[PDB]
Design a binder for this molecule. Structure first.
Ligand SMILES: Cc1cc2nc3c(=O)[nH]c(=O)nc-3n(C[C@H](O)[C@H](O)[C@H](O)COP(=O)(O)O)c2cc1C
Lengths: 386, 145
Protein backbone atom coordinates (compact mmCIF):
# COMPACT_ATOMS: atom_id res chain seq x y z
CA UNK A 1 0.00 0.00 0.00
CA UNK A 2 2.44 2.78 0.92
CA UNK A 3 5.32 1.44 -1.17
CA UNK A 4 3.94 0.29 -4.51
CA UNK A 5 1.19 2.91 -4.84
CA UNK A 6 3.65 5.25 -6.56
CA UNK A 7 3.67 4.74 -10.32
CA UNK A 8 7.37 5.61 -10.34
CA UNK A 9 8.67 2.68 -8.28
CA UNK A 10 6.48 -0.03 -9.82
CA UNK A 11 7.64 1.17 -13.24
CA UNK A 12 11.30 1.30 -12.21
CA UNK A 13 11.01 -2.17 -10.68
CA UNK A 14 9.46 -3.44 -13.91
CA UNK A 15 12.01 -1.59 -16.04
CA UNK A 16 14.64 -3.51 -14.08
CA UNK A 17 13.00 -6.56 -15.63
CA UNK A 18 10.97 -7.75 -12.65
CA UNK A 19 7.39 -8.75 -11.83
CA UNK A 20 5.50 -6.30 -9.59
CA UNK A 21 2.00 -5.61 -8.25
CA UNK A 22 0.53 -2.09 -8.28
CA UNK A 23 -1.14 -1.34 -4.94
CA UNK A 24 -4.87 -0.66 -4.92
CA UNK A 25 -5.15 0.44 -1.30
CA UNK A 26 -4.01 3.93 -2.24
CA UNK A 27 -6.53 4.42 -5.04
CA UNK A 28 -10.13 5.27 -4.11
CA UNK A 29 -11.71 5.54 -7.58
CA UNK A 30 -11.48 4.19 -11.13
CA UNK A 31 -10.41 7.60 -12.44
CA UNK A 32 -7.62 8.25 -9.93
CA UNK A 33 -6.28 4.73 -10.48
CA UNK A 34 -6.59 5.05 -14.26
CA UNK A 35 -4.17 7.96 -13.91
CA UNK A 36 -1.64 5.62 -12.31
CA UNK A 37 -1.87 2.99 -15.05
CA UNK A 38 -1.53 5.79 -17.59
CA UNK A 39 1.50 7.08 -15.70
CA UNK A 40 2.70 3.48 -15.55
CA UNK A 41 2.25 2.73 -19.26
CA UNK A 42 4.02 6.00 -20.03
CA UNK A 43 6.95 5.06 -17.80
CA UNK A 44 6.52 1.51 -19.08
CA UNK A 45 8.96 1.10 -21.93
CA UNK A 46 7.96 -0.98 -24.98
CA UNK A 47 6.40 -4.37 -24.28
CA UNK A 48 6.92 -4.38 -20.52
CA UNK A 49 4.02 -5.58 -18.37
CA UNK A 50 2.81 -5.28 -14.75
CA UNK A 51 -0.04 -6.57 -12.52
CA UNK A 52 -2.52 -5.18 -9.96
CA UNK A 53 -3.30 -5.87 -6.28
CA UNK A 54 -6.76 -5.69 -4.67
CA UNK A 55 -8.10 -6.16 -1.12
CA UNK A 56 -11.01 -8.34 0.06
CA UNK A 57 -11.46 -6.56 3.40
CA UNK A 58 -14.48 -4.23 3.11
CA UNK A 59 -17.71 -4.13 1.04
CA UNK A 60 -17.22 -0.57 -0.27
CA UNK A 61 -13.96 -1.59 -1.94
CA UNK A 62 -15.58 -4.75 -3.31
CA UNK A 63 -18.36 -2.60 -4.77
CA UNK A 64 -15.63 -0.24 -5.96
CA UNK A 65 -13.95 -3.28 -7.48
CA UNK A 66 -17.08 -4.00 -9.53
CA UNK A 67 -16.23 -0.67 -11.11
CA UNK A 68 -12.59 -1.55 -10.61
CA UNK A 69 -12.73 -4.92 -12.35
CA UNK A 70 -14.73 -3.40 -15.20
CA UNK A 71 -12.05 -0.72 -15.25
CA UNK A 72 -9.50 -3.52 -15.51
CA UNK A 73 -11.84 -5.08 -18.07
CA UNK A 74 -12.13 -1.79 -19.99
CA UNK A 75 -8.38 -1.19 -19.77
CA UNK A 76 -7.55 -4.63 -21.15
CA UNK A 77 -10.45 -4.52 -23.60
CA UNK A 78 -8.53 -1.47 -24.77
CA UNK A 79 -5.41 -3.65 -24.66
CA UNK A 80 -3.75 -2.28 -21.51
CA UNK A 81 -0.27 -3.65 -20.58
CA UNK A 82 -1.41 -4.90 -17.16
CA UNK A 83 -1.07 -8.68 -17.32
CA UNK A 84 -2.23 -9.91 -13.89
CA UNK A 85 -4.62 -9.52 -10.95
CA UNK A 86 -3.85 -10.02 -7.23
CA UNK A 87 -6.60 -10.66 -4.68
CA UNK A 88 -5.51 -10.00 -1.10
CA UNK A 89 -6.53 -10.39 2.56
CA UNK A 90 -8.88 -13.22 1.59
CA UNK A 91 -9.68 -15.91 -0.96
CA UNK A 92 -12.78 -15.27 -3.12
CA UNK A 93 -15.46 -17.95 -3.27
CA UNK A 94 -15.60 -20.20 -6.34
CA UNK A 95 -18.32 -18.21 -8.13
CA UNK A 96 -16.47 -14.98 -7.33
CA UNK A 97 -13.17 -16.40 -8.58
CA UNK A 98 -14.70 -17.83 -11.76
CA UNK A 99 -15.94 -14.35 -12.61
CA UNK A 100 -12.43 -12.90 -12.25
CA UNK A 101 -10.82 -15.67 -14.30
CA UNK A 102 -13.46 -15.54 -17.06
CA UNK A 103 -13.64 -11.73 -17.47
CA UNK A 104 -13.51 -10.07 -20.90
CA UNK A 105 -9.94 -9.18 -19.91
CA UNK A 106 -9.08 -12.83 -19.12
CA UNK A 107 -6.28 -13.34 -21.66
CA UNK A 108 -4.84 -10.08 -20.41
CA UNK A 109 -5.14 -11.53 -16.91
CA UNK A 110 -3.15 -14.58 -18.06
CA UNK A 111 -2.96 -15.82 -14.46
CA UNK A 112 -4.76 -15.13 -11.18
CA UNK A 113 -3.04 -14.43 -7.87
CA UNK A 114 -4.33 -15.52 -4.46
CA UNK A 115 -2.83 -15.18 -0.98
CA UNK A 116 -3.99 -17.93 1.44
CA UNK A 117 -3.24 -17.27 5.11
CA UNK A 118 -4.56 -20.54 6.56
CA UNK A 119 -4.73 -24.27 5.82
CA UNK A 120 -8.39 -23.84 4.89
CA UNK A 121 -7.57 -20.84 2.70
CA UNK A 122 -4.98 -22.97 0.88
CA UNK A 123 -7.50 -25.77 0.33
CA UNK A 124 -9.93 -23.15 -0.98
CA UNK A 125 -7.52 -22.08 -3.74
CA UNK A 126 -6.98 -25.74 -4.66
CA UNK A 127 -10.70 -25.82 -5.42
CA UNK A 128 -10.28 -22.65 -7.48
CA UNK A 129 -7.49 -24.45 -9.33
CA UNK A 130 -9.60 -27.51 -10.13
CA UNK A 131 -12.28 -25.10 -11.33
CA UNK A 132 -10.27 -24.02 -14.37
CA UNK A 133 -7.39 -26.54 -14.71
CA UNK A 134 -6.04 -24.74 -17.79
CA UNK A 135 -5.78 -21.36 -16.07
CA UNK A 136 -2.46 -20.54 -14.37
CA UNK A 137 -2.93 -19.69 -10.69
CA UNK A 138 -0.02 -18.31 -8.71
CA UNK A 139 -0.50 -19.22 -5.08
CA UNK A 140 1.53 -16.92 -2.87
CA UNK A 141 1.84 -18.51 0.56
CA UNK A 142 2.63 -15.81 3.10
CA UNK A 143 3.27 -15.93 6.83
CA UNK A 144 2.48 -13.80 9.83
CA UNK A 145 6.21 -13.20 10.10
CA UNK A 146 5.60 -11.08 7.02
CA UNK A 147 4.81 -7.37 7.08
CA UNK A 148 1.51 -5.52 7.23
CA UNK A 149 -1.56 -7.71 7.26
CA UNK A 150 -0.91 -10.44 9.79
CA UNK A 151 -1.78 -14.00 10.83
CA UNK A 152 -1.19 -16.52 13.61
CA UNK A 153 -0.13 -19.26 11.19
CA UNK A 154 3.42 -20.64 10.99
CA UNK A 155 5.52 -20.36 7.82
CA UNK A 156 6.46 -24.03 7.61
CA UNK A 157 3.64 -26.15 9.06
CA UNK A 158 1.05 -24.80 6.61
CA UNK A 159 3.16 -25.45 3.52
CA UNK A 160 4.56 -28.61 5.10
CA UNK A 161 1.09 -30.17 5.34
CA UNK A 162 -0.60 -28.80 2.21
CA UNK A 163 2.24 -29.14 -0.31
CA UNK A 164 1.36 -32.62 -1.59
CA UNK A 165 -2.21 -31.66 -2.50
CA UNK A 166 -0.97 -28.39 -4.01
CA UNK A 167 1.23 -30.29 -6.47
CA UNK A 168 -1.61 -32.47 -7.74
CA UNK A 169 -2.71 -29.40 -9.70
CA UNK A 170 -0.43 -28.41 -12.58
CA UNK A 171 -2.08 -25.00 -12.87
CA UNK A 172 -0.90 -24.08 -9.38
CA UNK A 173 2.32 -22.08 -9.16
CA UNK A 174 3.65 -22.26 -5.61
CA UNK A 175 5.37 -19.12 -4.32
CA UNK A 176 6.85 -18.79 -0.84
CA UNK A 177 7.14 -15.40 0.79
CA UNK A 178 7.87 -13.52 3.98
CA UNK A 179 11.02 -12.97 6.04
CA UNK A 180 13.32 -13.08 3.03
CA UNK A 181 15.86 -10.35 2.27
CA UNK A 182 18.55 -12.35 0.48
CA UNK A 183 19.28 -14.98 -2.20
CA UNK A 184 21.23 -17.12 0.28
CA UNK A 185 18.52 -17.61 2.90
CA UNK A 186 15.89 -18.14 0.19
CA UNK A 187 17.97 -20.60 -1.82
CA UNK A 188 17.01 -23.66 0.22
CA UNK A 189 13.29 -23.23 -0.41
CA UNK A 190 14.12 -23.22 -4.12
CA UNK A 191 16.26 -26.36 -3.96
CA UNK A 192 13.69 -27.92 -1.65
CA UNK A 193 16.37 -28.47 0.98
CA UNK A 194 14.29 -26.48 3.48
CA UNK A 195 11.92 -29.37 4.24
CA UNK A 196 14.81 -31.62 5.22
CA UNK A 197 15.11 -29.98 8.65
CA UNK A 198 11.56 -31.15 9.33
CA UNK A 199 12.40 -34.59 7.98
CA UNK A 200 10.06 -34.23 5.01
CA UNK A 201 11.63 -35.10 1.63
CA UNK A 202 12.65 -32.22 -0.66
CA UNK A 203 9.97 -29.60 -1.29
CA UNK A 204 11.00 -27.15 -4.07
CA UNK A 205 9.19 -23.88 -4.88
CA UNK A 206 8.41 -22.09 -8.16
CA UNK A 207 8.91 -18.50 -7.00
CA UNK A 208 9.69 -16.07 -4.18
CA UNK A 209 8.23 -12.68 -3.23
CA UNK A 210 10.06 -9.95 -1.32
CA UNK A 211 7.86 -7.39 0.41
CA UNK A 212 9.98 -5.81 3.12
CA UNK A 213 13.57 -5.70 1.84
CA UNK A 214 12.53 -3.49 -1.09
CA UNK A 215 11.26 -0.65 1.12
CA UNK A 216 14.69 0.90 1.68
CA UNK A 217 15.25 0.99 -2.08
CA UNK A 218 16.31 4.11 -3.99
CA UNK A 219 13.31 4.43 -6.30
CA UNK A 220 10.95 3.86 -3.37
CA UNK A 221 9.07 6.95 -2.18
CA UNK A 222 9.94 6.15 1.44
CA UNK A 223 11.20 9.28 3.21
CA UNK A 224 14.97 9.63 3.90
CA UNK A 225 14.42 9.54 7.67
CA UNK A 226 12.04 6.58 7.42
CA UNK A 227 14.54 4.60 5.35
CA UNK A 228 17.27 5.17 7.95
CA UNK A 229 14.75 3.96 10.53
CA UNK A 230 13.94 0.72 8.70
CA UNK A 231 17.68 0.17 8.29
CA UNK A 232 18.88 0.48 11.90
CA UNK A 233 16.17 -1.96 12.95
CA UNK A 234 17.78 -5.28 13.88
CA UNK A 235 16.07 -8.41 12.58
CA UNK A 236 15.23 -11.76 14.12
CA UNK A 237 15.01 -15.51 13.68
CA UNK A 238 11.65 -17.33 13.88
CA UNK A 239 8.97 -15.11 15.43
CA UNK A 240 8.40 -15.25 19.18
CA UNK A 241 5.12 -15.04 21.08
CA UNK A 242 6.14 -12.92 24.07
CA UNK A 243 4.62 -9.44 23.91
CA UNK A 244 7.32 -6.80 23.44
CA UNK A 245 9.05 -4.91 20.70
CA UNK A 246 10.79 -7.88 19.12
CA UNK A 247 13.88 -6.88 17.17
CA UNK A 248 12.43 -3.45 16.51
CA UNK A 249 9.16 -5.10 15.55
CA UNK A 250 5.94 -5.33 17.55
CA UNK A 251 2.49 -6.37 16.36
CA UNK A 252 -0.54 -4.13 16.73
CA UNK A 253 -4.21 -4.37 15.82
CA UNK A 254 -5.96 -2.24 13.21
CA UNK A 255 -9.32 -0.52 13.65
CA UNK A 256 -10.97 -3.80 12.64
CA UNK A 257 -9.00 -5.82 15.19
CA UNK A 258 -6.68 -7.59 12.76
CA UNK A 259 -2.98 -7.50 13.64
CA UNK A 260 -0.53 -5.29 11.77
CA UNK A 261 3.25 -5.60 11.81
CA UNK A 262 4.68 -2.14 12.40
CA UNK A 263 8.04 -0.74 13.42
CA UNK A 264 8.09 -0.31 17.20
CA UNK A 265 11.74 0.72 17.49
CA UNK A 266 11.89 3.40 14.81
CA UNK A 267 8.62 4.59 16.31
CA UNK A 268 8.01 3.39 19.87
CA UNK A 269 5.42 6.01 20.80
CA UNK A 270 2.45 5.16 18.56
CA UNK A 271 2.37 1.39 18.94
CA UNK A 272 2.89 1.01 22.68
CA UNK A 273 0.51 3.84 23.60
CA UNK A 274 -2.08 2.27 21.32
CA UNK A 275 -1.73 -0.98 23.26
CA UNK A 276 -1.99 1.04 26.47
CA UNK A 277 -5.13 2.87 25.34
CA UNK A 278 -6.69 -0.29 23.87
CA UNK A 279 -6.27 -2.36 27.02
CA UNK A 280 -7.14 0.64 29.19
CA UNK A 281 -10.46 1.71 27.75
CA UNK A 282 -13.06 1.68 30.44
CA UNK A 283 -11.46 4.15 32.82
CA UNK A 284 -10.06 6.44 30.08
CA UNK A 285 -11.67 9.41 31.85
CA UNK A 286 -9.41 8.73 34.86
CA UNK A 287 -6.20 8.47 32.82
CA UNK A 288 -7.34 11.31 30.53
CA UNK A 289 -4.36 13.50 31.48
CA UNK A 290 -1.97 10.63 30.73
CA UNK A 291 -3.81 9.71 27.53
CA UNK A 292 -4.40 13.18 26.05
CA UNK A 293 -0.75 14.17 26.52
CA UNK A 294 0.47 10.99 24.84
CA UNK A 295 -1.63 11.78 21.77
CA UNK A 296 0.30 15.05 21.61
CA UNK A 297 3.58 13.14 21.86
CA UNK A 298 2.76 11.07 18.78
CA UNK A 299 1.37 14.20 17.12
CA UNK A 300 -2.32 13.35 17.20
CA UNK A 301 -3.15 16.75 18.67
CA UNK A 302 -6.42 17.47 20.40
CA UNK A 303 -7.43 21.12 20.37
CA UNK A 304 -6.79 23.53 23.23
CA UNK A 305 -9.80 23.92 25.52
CA UNK A 306 -12.67 23.84 23.08
CA UNK A 307 -14.84 26.61 24.47
CA UNK A 308 -12.05 28.98 25.52
CA UNK A 309 -10.22 28.61 22.20
CA UNK A 310 -10.62 31.58 19.87
CA UNK A 311 -11.98 31.07 16.33
CA UNK A 312 -8.56 32.19 15.08
CA UNK A 313 -6.98 29.34 17.04
CA UNK A 314 -9.44 26.98 15.36
CA UNK A 315 -8.82 28.32 11.86
CA UNK A 316 -5.09 28.81 12.50
CA UNK A 317 -4.72 25.22 13.73
CA UNK A 318 -6.11 23.68 10.55
CA UNK A 319 -3.77 25.82 8.45
CA UNK A 320 -0.92 24.78 10.75
CA UNK A 321 -1.60 21.05 10.32
CA UNK A 322 -2.93 20.93 6.74
CA UNK A 323 -0.58 23.44 5.11
CA UNK A 324 3.08 22.44 5.13
CA UNK A 325 5.55 25.33 4.97
CA UNK A 326 8.27 23.20 3.41
CA UNK A 327 6.09 21.68 0.71
CA UNK A 328 4.24 24.98 0.22
CA UNK A 329 0.67 23.86 -0.60
CA UNK A 330 0.46 26.64 -3.19
CA UNK A 331 3.67 25.30 -4.76
CA UNK A 332 2.36 21.76 -4.19
CA UNK A 333 -0.70 22.47 -6.35
CA UNK A 334 1.32 23.48 -9.42
CA UNK A 335 2.99 20.11 -10.18
CA UNK A 336 -0.45 18.51 -9.63
CA UNK A 337 0.96 16.14 -7.02
CA UNK A 338 -1.25 13.26 -5.79
CA UNK A 339 -0.27 14.26 -2.25
CA UNK A 340 -2.59 17.25 -2.67
CA UNK A 341 -4.86 17.70 0.34
CA UNK A 342 -7.56 19.64 -1.50
CA UNK A 343 -10.36 18.12 0.60
CA UNK A 344 -8.47 19.57 3.59
CA UNK A 345 -8.52 22.96 1.87
CA UNK A 346 -12.22 22.42 1.22
CA UNK A 347 -12.63 21.34 4.85
CA UNK A 348 -11.10 24.61 6.01
CA UNK A 349 -13.44 26.55 3.71
CA UNK A 350 -16.56 24.99 5.21
CA UNK A 351 -15.18 26.03 8.61
CA UNK A 352 -14.40 29.54 7.36
CA UNK A 353 -17.83 29.90 5.77
CA UNK A 354 -19.32 28.67 9.04
CA UNK A 355 -17.49 31.45 10.89
CA UNK A 356 -19.17 34.05 8.69
CA UNK A 357 -22.37 32.06 9.15
CA UNK A 358 -22.04 32.28 12.93
CA UNK A 359 -21.24 35.95 13.58
CA UNK A 360 -23.20 37.91 10.95
CA UNK A 361 -26.30 39.78 12.26
CA UNK A 362 -27.30 41.00 8.78
CA UNK A 363 -28.60 39.36 5.59
CA UNK A 364 -25.28 37.71 4.56
CA UNK A 365 -25.36 39.43 1.18
CA UNK A 366 -21.85 40.93 0.98
CA UNK A 367 -19.72 38.14 2.47
CA UNK A 368 -21.12 34.91 1.01
CA UNK A 369 -21.31 36.13 -2.60
CA UNK A 370 -17.60 37.01 -2.57
CA UNK A 371 -15.72 34.01 -1.18
CA UNK A 372 -17.82 31.59 -3.27
CA UNK A 373 -16.51 32.79 -6.64
CA UNK A 374 -14.05 30.45 -8.38
CA UNK A 375 -11.49 33.02 -9.54
CA UNK A 376 -11.87 35.06 -6.35
CA UNK A 377 -12.11 32.22 -3.83
CA UNK A 378 -9.28 30.09 -5.21
CA UNK A 379 -6.92 33.08 -5.00
CA UNK A 380 -8.03 33.57 -1.40
CA UNK A 381 -7.33 29.89 -0.71
CA UNK A 382 -3.71 29.67 -1.87
CA UNK A 383 -2.90 32.37 0.68
CA UNK A 384 -4.11 30.90 4.01
CA UNK A 385 -2.77 33.65 6.29
CA UNK A 386 -4.26 36.46 4.21
CA UNK B 1 -9.42 7.95 14.89
CA UNK B 2 -5.93 6.73 15.77
CA UNK B 3 -5.35 3.89 13.31
CA UNK B 4 -7.13 5.29 10.24
CA UNK B 5 -5.00 6.07 7.17
CA UNK B 6 -1.66 5.69 8.97
CA UNK B 7 0.33 4.26 6.05
CA UNK B 8 1.04 7.39 3.99
CA UNK B 9 3.30 9.38 6.33
CA UNK B 10 6.31 7.18 5.57
CA UNK B 11 6.52 8.69 2.09
CA UNK B 12 7.41 12.33 1.32
CA UNK B 13 6.92 13.77 4.82
CA UNK B 14 9.17 16.22 6.69
CA UNK B 15 7.71 15.27 10.07
CA UNK B 16 9.48 13.32 12.80
CA UNK B 17 9.43 9.73 11.57
CA UNK B 18 9.27 8.33 15.10
CA UNK B 19 5.58 9.28 15.33
CA UNK B 20 4.60 7.25 12.28
CA UNK B 21 3.27 3.75 11.74
CA UNK B 22 5.74 2.21 9.30
CA UNK B 23 5.39 -1.39 8.24
CA UNK B 24 8.21 -3.98 8.13
CA UNK B 25 8.09 -7.70 8.89
CA UNK B 26 9.92 -9.22 11.86
CA UNK B 27 12.45 -11.59 10.28
CA UNK B 28 12.86 -9.79 6.94
CA UNK B 29 14.27 -6.78 8.80
CA UNK B 30 17.57 -8.61 9.38
CA UNK B 31 18.03 -8.74 5.62
CA UNK B 32 17.50 -4.98 5.49
CA UNK B 33 20.73 -3.05 5.95
CA UNK B 34 21.75 -1.10 2.84
CA UNK B 35 19.87 2.20 2.52
CA UNK B 36 18.71 3.81 -0.76
CA UNK B 37 19.92 0.78 -2.70
CA UNK B 38 18.20 0.76 -6.14
CA UNK B 39 15.43 -1.80 -6.76
CA UNK B 40 17.32 -3.14 -9.76
CA UNK B 41 20.31 -3.89 -7.55
CA UNK B 42 18.40 -5.73 -4.82
CA UNK B 43 16.37 -7.91 -7.18
CA UNK B 44 19.42 -8.73 -9.31
CA UNK B 45 21.44 -9.43 -6.16
CA UNK B 46 18.89 -12.15 -5.47
CA UNK B 47 19.02 -13.58 -8.98
CA UNK B 48 22.78 -13.24 -9.54
CA UNK B 49 23.82 -15.00 -6.31
CA UNK B 50 21.14 -17.65 -6.84
CA UNK B 51 22.65 -18.32 -10.25
CA UNK B 52 26.19 -18.62 -8.86
CA UNK B 53 25.15 -21.09 -6.16
CA UNK B 54 23.26 -23.16 -8.73
CA UNK B 55 26.11 -22.83 -11.24
CA UNK B 56 28.98 -23.83 -8.97
CA UNK B 57 27.71 -27.16 -7.63
CA UNK B 58 25.32 -28.84 -10.06
CA UNK B 59 25.99 -26.93 -13.27
CA UNK B 60 29.72 -26.23 -12.85
CA UNK B 61 30.03 -23.53 -15.54
CA UNK B 62 26.97 -24.79 -17.42
CA UNK B 63 26.39 -24.61 -21.16
CA UNK B 64 23.41 -22.41 -20.26
CA UNK B 65 25.58 -19.87 -18.44
CA UNK B 66 28.28 -19.88 -21.12
CA UNK B 67 25.70 -19.60 -23.90
CA UNK B 68 24.40 -16.42 -22.26
CA UNK B 69 27.63 -14.40 -22.21
CA UNK B 70 28.15 -15.65 -25.77
CA UNK B 71 24.50 -14.98 -26.72
CA UNK B 72 22.90 -18.38 -27.38
CA UNK B 73 19.27 -19.22 -26.69
CA UNK B 74 16.39 -21.46 -25.72
CA UNK B 75 13.06 -21.22 -27.57
CA UNK B 76 14.11 -19.92 -30.99
CA UNK B 77 11.83 -18.26 -33.58
CA UNK B 78 9.68 -21.35 -34.18
CA UNK B 79 9.12 -21.92 -30.45
CA UNK B 80 8.51 -18.26 -29.58
CA UNK B 81 5.55 -18.22 -31.98
CA UNK B 82 4.04 -21.22 -30.18
CA UNK B 83 5.06 -20.08 -26.69
CA UNK B 84 4.12 -16.48 -25.86
CA UNK B 85 0.31 -16.07 -25.56
CA UNK B 86 0.61 -12.28 -26.06
CA UNK B 87 0.99 -10.71 -29.54
CA UNK B 88 1.89 -7.03 -29.49
CA UNK B 89 0.67 -4.53 -32.08
CA UNK B 90 2.11 -1.08 -31.45
CA UNK B 91 1.52 -0.54 -27.74
CA UNK B 92 -1.50 -2.85 -27.55
CA UNK B 93 -1.45 -6.44 -26.32
CA UNK B 94 -3.31 -9.21 -28.17
CA UNK B 95 -3.79 -12.95 -27.71
CA UNK B 96 -1.72 -15.30 -29.90
CA UNK B 97 -3.76 -16.20 -33.01
CA UNK B 98 -1.73 -19.39 -33.37
CA UNK B 99 -3.49 -20.68 -30.25
CA UNK B 100 -6.66 -20.46 -32.33
CA UNK B 101 -4.70 -21.23 -35.50
CA UNK B 102 -2.92 -24.40 -34.33
CA UNK B 103 -5.69 -26.76 -33.18
CA UNK B 104 -8.87 -25.35 -34.81
CA UNK B 105 -7.20 -25.47 -38.25
CA UNK B 106 -8.61 -28.24 -40.44
CA UNK B 107 -5.32 -28.63 -42.30
CA UNK B 108 -2.25 -27.52 -40.35
CA UNK B 109 1.26 -27.82 -41.76
CA UNK B 110 4.71 -27.49 -40.19
CA UNK B 111 7.27 -27.24 -42.99
CA UNK B 112 10.87 -28.38 -42.45
CA UNK B 113 10.69 -29.07 -38.71
CA UNK B 114 14.27 -29.91 -37.71
CA UNK B 115 15.68 -27.11 -39.88
CA UNK B 116 15.17 -23.79 -38.10
CA UNK B 117 15.89 -21.26 -40.86
CA UNK B 118 13.42 -22.81 -43.31
CA UNK B 119 10.80 -23.60 -40.65
CA UNK B 120 7.23 -22.76 -41.70
CA UNK B 121 3.89 -23.24 -39.92
CA UNK B 122 0.76 -22.91 -42.08
CA UNK B 123 -2.98 -23.51 -41.66
CA UNK B 124 -6.27 -24.00 -43.54
CA UNK B 125 -7.44 -20.72 -41.99
CA UNK B 126 -4.83 -19.35 -44.38
CA UNK B 127 -2.24 -18.23 -41.83
CA UNK B 128 1.45 -19.00 -42.31
CA UNK B 129 4.55 -18.22 -40.23
CA UNK B 130 8.20 -18.00 -41.27
CA UNK B 131 11.40 -16.17 -40.30
CA UNK B 132 12.94 -13.35 -42.33
CA UNK B 133 15.96 -11.08 -41.77
CA UNK B 134 17.12 -13.05 -38.71
CA UNK B 135 15.21 -12.05 -35.56
CA UNK B 136 12.14 -10.88 -37.50
CA UNK B 137 9.33 -13.46 -37.52
CA UNK B 138 6.87 -13.22 -40.42
CA UNK B 139 3.26 -14.34 -39.96
CA UNK B 140 1.30 -14.37 -43.21
CA UNK B 141 -2.48 -14.69 -43.17
CA UNK B 142 -4.70 -14.54 -46.25
CA UNK B 143 -8.34 -14.11 -47.27
CA UNK B 144 -9.20 -15.70 -50.62
CA UNK B 145 -6.40 -14.69 -53.01
C1 LIG C 1 4.14 -1.73 3.73
C2 LIG C 1 3.49 -3.00 3.29
C3 LIG C 1 2.25 -2.98 2.66
C4 LIG C 1 1.64 -4.16 2.25
N1 LIG C 1 0.41 -4.14 1.63
C5 LIG C 1 -0.18 -5.32 1.23
C6 LIG C 1 -1.42 -5.34 0.59
O1 LIG C 1 -2.01 -4.29 0.37
N2 LIG C 1 -1.98 -6.54 0.21
C7 LIG C 1 -1.31 -7.73 0.45
O2 LIG C 1 -1.79 -8.81 0.12
N3 LIG C 1 -0.09 -7.72 1.08
C8 LIG C 1 0.47 -6.52 1.46
N4 LIG C 1 1.69 -6.55 2.09
C9 LIG C 1 2.36 -7.87 2.32
C10 LIG C 1 3.25 -8.17 1.12
O3 LIG C 1 2.46 -8.22 -0.04
C11 LIG C 1 3.99 -9.50 1.29
O4 LIG C 1 3.05 -10.54 1.39
C12 LIG C 1 4.88 -9.49 2.52
O5 LIG C 1 5.38 -8.20 2.76
C13 LIG C 1 6.05 -10.44 2.33
O6 LIG C 1 6.68 -10.67 3.57
P1 LIG C 1 8.06 -9.92 3.91
O7 LIG C 1 8.00 -8.53 3.34
O8 LIG C 1 8.20 -9.81 5.41
O9 LIG C 1 9.24 -10.67 3.32
C14 LIG C 1 2.29 -5.37 2.48
C15 LIG C 1 3.53 -5.40 3.12
C16 LIG C 1 4.13 -4.22 3.52
C17 LIG C 1 5.47 -4.27 4.19
Amino acid sequence: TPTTVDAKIVAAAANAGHWAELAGGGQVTEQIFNDRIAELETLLEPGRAIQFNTLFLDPYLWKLQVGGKRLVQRARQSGAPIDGLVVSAGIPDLEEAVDIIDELNEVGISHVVFKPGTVEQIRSVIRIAAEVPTKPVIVHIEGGRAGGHHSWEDLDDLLLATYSELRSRSNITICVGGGIGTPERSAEYLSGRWAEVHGYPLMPIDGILVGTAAMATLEATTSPQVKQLLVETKGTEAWVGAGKAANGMASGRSQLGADIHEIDNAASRCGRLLDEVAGDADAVAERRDEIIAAMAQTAKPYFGDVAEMTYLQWLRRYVELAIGDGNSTADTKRPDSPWLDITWRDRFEQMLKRAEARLHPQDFGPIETLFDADADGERLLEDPEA
Amino acid sequence: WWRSDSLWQAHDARYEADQVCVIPGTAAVAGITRVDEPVGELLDRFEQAAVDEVLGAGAXXXXXXXXXXXXXXXXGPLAVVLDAPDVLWAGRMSVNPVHRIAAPXXXXXXXXXXXXXXXXXXXXXXXXXXXXXXXXXXXXXXXXX
